[PDB]
Amino acid sequence: DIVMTQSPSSMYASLGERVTITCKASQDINSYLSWFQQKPGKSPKNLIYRANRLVDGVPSRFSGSGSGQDYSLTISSLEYEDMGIYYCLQYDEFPWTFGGGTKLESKRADAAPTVSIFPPSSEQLTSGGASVVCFLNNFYPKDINVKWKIDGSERQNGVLNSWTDQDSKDSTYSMSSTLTLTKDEYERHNSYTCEATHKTSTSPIVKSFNRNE
Amino acid sequence: EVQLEESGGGLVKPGGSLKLSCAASGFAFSIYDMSWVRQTPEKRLEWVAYISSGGGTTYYPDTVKGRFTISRDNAKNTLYLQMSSLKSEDTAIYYCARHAGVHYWGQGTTLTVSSAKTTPPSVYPLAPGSASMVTLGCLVKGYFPEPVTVTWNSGSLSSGVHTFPAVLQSDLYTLSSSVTVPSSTWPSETVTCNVAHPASSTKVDKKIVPRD
Ligand code: NA
Ligand code: NA
Ligand code: NA
Ligand code: NA
Numbered sequence A: 001d002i003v004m005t006q007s008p009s010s011m012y013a014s015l016g017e018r019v020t021i022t023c024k025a026s027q028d029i030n031s032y033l034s035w036f037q038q039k040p041g042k043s044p045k046n047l048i049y050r051a052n053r054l055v056d057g058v059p060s061r062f063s064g065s066g067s068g069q070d071y072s073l074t075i076s077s078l079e080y081e082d083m084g085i086y087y088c089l090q091y092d093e094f095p096w097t098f099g100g101g102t103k104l105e106s107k108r109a110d111a112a113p114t115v116s117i118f119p120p121s122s123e124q125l126t127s128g129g130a131s132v133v134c135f136l137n138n139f140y141p142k143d144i145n146v147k148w149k150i151d152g153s154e155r156q157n158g159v160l161n162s163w164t165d166q167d168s169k170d171s172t173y174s175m176s177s178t179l180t181l182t183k184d185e186y187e188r189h190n191s192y193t194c195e196a197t198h199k200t201s202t203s204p205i206v207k208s209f210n211r212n213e
Numbered sequence B: 001e002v003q004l005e006e007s008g009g010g011l012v013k014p015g016g017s018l019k020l021s022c023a024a025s026g027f028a029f030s031i032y033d034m035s036w037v038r039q040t041p042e043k044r045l046e047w048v049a050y051i052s053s054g055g056g057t058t059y060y061p062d063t064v065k066g067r068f069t070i071s072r073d074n075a076k077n078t079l080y081l082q083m084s085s086l087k088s089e090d091t092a093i094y095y096c097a098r099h100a101g102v103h104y105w106g107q108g109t110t111l112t113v114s115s116a117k118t119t120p121p122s123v124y125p126l127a128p129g130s131a132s133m134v135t136l137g138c139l140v141k142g143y144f145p146e147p148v149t150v151t152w153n154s155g156s157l158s159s160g161v162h163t164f165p166a167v168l169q170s171d172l173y174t175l176s177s178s179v180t181v182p183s184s185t186w187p188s189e190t191v192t193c194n195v196a197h198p199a200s201s202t203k204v205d206k207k208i209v210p211r212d
Helices: A122-127
Strands: A004-007 A010-013 A019-025 A033-038 A045-049 A062-067 A070-075 A084-090 A102-106 A114-118 A129-139 A145-150 A153-155 A159-163 A173-182 A191-197 A205-210 B003-007 B010-012 B018-025 B034-039 B045-051 B068-073 B078-083 B092-098 B109-113 B122-126 B133-143 B149-152 B161-163 B167-169 B172-182 B192-197 B202-207
Touching: A004 A084, A010 A019, A019 A033, A019 A084, A019 A102, A033 A062, A045 A062, A070 A084, A114 A191, A114 A205, A114 B133, A122 A129, A122 B122, A129 A145, A129 A191, A129 B133, A129 B172, A145 A159, A145 A173, A159 B167, A159 B172, A173 B172, B003 B092, B018 B034, B018 B092, B018 B109, B034 B068, B034 B078, B045 B068, B045 B078, B078 B092, B122 B192, B122 B202, B133 B149, B133 B192, B149 B172
Parallel strands: A010 A102, B010 B109
Antiparallel strands: A004 A019, A019 A070, A033 A045, A033 A084, A062 A070, A084 A102, A114 A129, A129 A173, A145 A153, A145 A191, A159 A173, A191 A205, B003 B018, B018 B078, B034 B045, B034 B092, B068 B078, B092 B109, B122 B133, B133 B172, B149 B192, B161 B172, B167 B172, B192 B202
C-alpha cells in the first residue's frame, strides 16, 4: 500500500500566524490527496480535496498545493478554531491511506507547573498497594520532565505518566506522575520527592513529604 | 439534512464477533457507495471497507480481508459491518462515511477488543501530606473497561479540575483527577470526588479528609 507521512508531528502557533504542514506519499499519487481536520470528540471533516480544491463552506484562509509525492496545507492567518489534528488522505489507489496526522496547538508564554505530591492513602495501604501521586498542573510547553527521588536517590522504575490535552482556555498542559510500590517497599523509605524540570540546568519545581511525618 | 448514526459497539473478547449498524437518513441510501473508516487509540485513521451502491461489490484492505464483511439493507436504509475473528488491533472508533467521506461522516461507535474482565474501580482519596489554593486528588485504580466519569461535589466544582487520561496498569485502567480550591474552603467545606463506571453500574463517592 501507499505510505503517507506528515510533518511536523505537532507544532505550536499563535493567532494570525501563517501555518504550513506537509504530507509526503511513498509514490506518485497524481494529486489525489485530501486534507481533513479533526477536533476532540468529533469526526474528521474534509477541508480540501484534489490537493488544492476547497470544500464548500471552508473559510478562505485554507489552501493546498503540491504534486506527485509532496503536498502541503496552508492556513494564511490562524484562528483559534483551527486547532486540532490534520490528516492527509490519498485516494489514488485503494486501500486509501491516511498520513499520521499533524497536531496543531496553541502557542503561549512559558509557565512553570503547580506541583502537588500525595502520599498513598490509608485505604490503599490496607489493600497492600502504595501509589505516590504527583500532579504538575497548568504548565507550558507540554514537554516537561518529572524526576522521582526516594531518600535522595533517583527512582525510575514503577512510574506511570499521563498528559492532558491542551487546555482550551489558557493553552496550558497538565500531567500526573504516579509511582506505584507495594506497601512494604513504600514503607522502607522516608522522604519522597517529585521534581518538575522543563529545560536542563534550571532549578526544578519540587514537592516532598516524609513518611515519618 | 443527512444523518449517519452508528451503533453496535462495545466490549468483545478477541476471537469474538460483532455486527455494527449505520442507519442512514436524509438522502437516497440506495444510490451511494458506503464505507467504514476507523480511528485507533493512537489517533491513526484507516479505511476499513467499501461497498457499492447496490451492495453487490465490496473492497477491503488486507488487515481485515477475510474477517470483516460490509453489507447493506437498502429497504431499511442501513449499512452494516460484520466483524469476526476479532483481534485486539481492531480496537478503534468506527465511522460510516458516505462515498469518500467528502461531506458526511457519522459520529462513530467504539469497539474495544480485550479479554480483561469488567471491573469497578477502587477509589482512593489524595489529601496533602500532613505538613492560598489547595490541590486535592482522587485515585481511580483498577477499572475496566473505559470510560469512567469523575466529578467533584456532584459537578459544582467544575473549574480547576484536571482528570487525566487513563493509563494501563495490570490488565486494567488507572487514572487520577485533581481539583484545586481556595485554602479557605477545604477542609471546612467538604470536597468529595464522584466516580461513575457505567460498565459495572457503579457510582462511588469518596470524601477527601486531611491526613492524620
Ligand atoms: Na492497589
Ligand atoms: Na463480501
Ligand atoms: Na458530592
Ligand atoms: Na503496577
